[PDB]
């Protein structure tokens, strides 16, 4: 499958992960403003992180 991986508001980039049918967009606030980490798969997550898992290509924007 295909999914984004750029961090926060850097230009949209892609990462191809064959077979991985889900994707993720994690958001935590932190000291340095809203940080965002996108990637492949649907990961279990520590406390206080906005997780959003997704099912189509390049949908974790």
């Amino acid at each position: 499958l295909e999914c984004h991986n750029q961090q926060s508001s850097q230009p949209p980039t892609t990462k191809t992960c064959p077979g991985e049918t889900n994707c993720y967009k994690k958001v935590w606030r932190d000291h340095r403003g809203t940080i965002i980490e996108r990637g492949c798969g649907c990961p279990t997550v520590k406390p206080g992180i906005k997780l959003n898992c997704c099912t189509t290509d390049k949908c974790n924007n």
Epitope: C42, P43, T44, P47, L51
Partner: nanobody
Framework: QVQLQESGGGLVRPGGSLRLSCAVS???????????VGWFRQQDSGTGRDLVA?????????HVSGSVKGRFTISRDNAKNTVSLQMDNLKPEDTAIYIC????????????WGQGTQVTVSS
């Protein structure tokens, strides 16, 4: 094989409550204790699957999203193999399909996925 069965969907009047539950078939040995079992909410076109609650033995991987904090609560019967999500003071904004998922362990990816159950709050 592990397969996740949900139960408890339907229509709730605004302000009511309702308990979803997700039973992890497979691992019938009942040694799934640490499956990080997650509840996600899909509001159709708006947003994909939003993690609303995550249940693990590991504290850092057992919490609820701040949006629903105080209204939703998760419970676990590891022996009977069920992970329940009780929803109180249900608002219309909570109308969505709630899906269950299971990760093999804390920090691993949600590789198991559920059928989905609709919850409608409208009056």
């Amino acid at each position: 094989q592990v397969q996740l069965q949900e139960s408890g969907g339907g229509l709730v009047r605004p302000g009511g409550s309702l308990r979803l539950s997700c039973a992890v078939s497979g691992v019938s040995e009942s040694i799934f204790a640490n499956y990080v079992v997650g509840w996600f909410r899909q509001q159709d076109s708006g947003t994909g699957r939003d993690l609303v609650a995550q249940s693990s033995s590991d504290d850092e991987y057992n919490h609820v999203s701040g949006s629903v904090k105080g209204r939703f609560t998760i419970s676990r019967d590891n022996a009977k193999n069920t992970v329940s999500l009780q929803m109180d003071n249900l608002k219309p904004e909570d109308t969505a399909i709630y899906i269950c998922a299971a990760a093999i362990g804390p920090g691993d990816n949600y590789i198991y996925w559920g059928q989905g159950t609709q919850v409608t709050v409208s009056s």
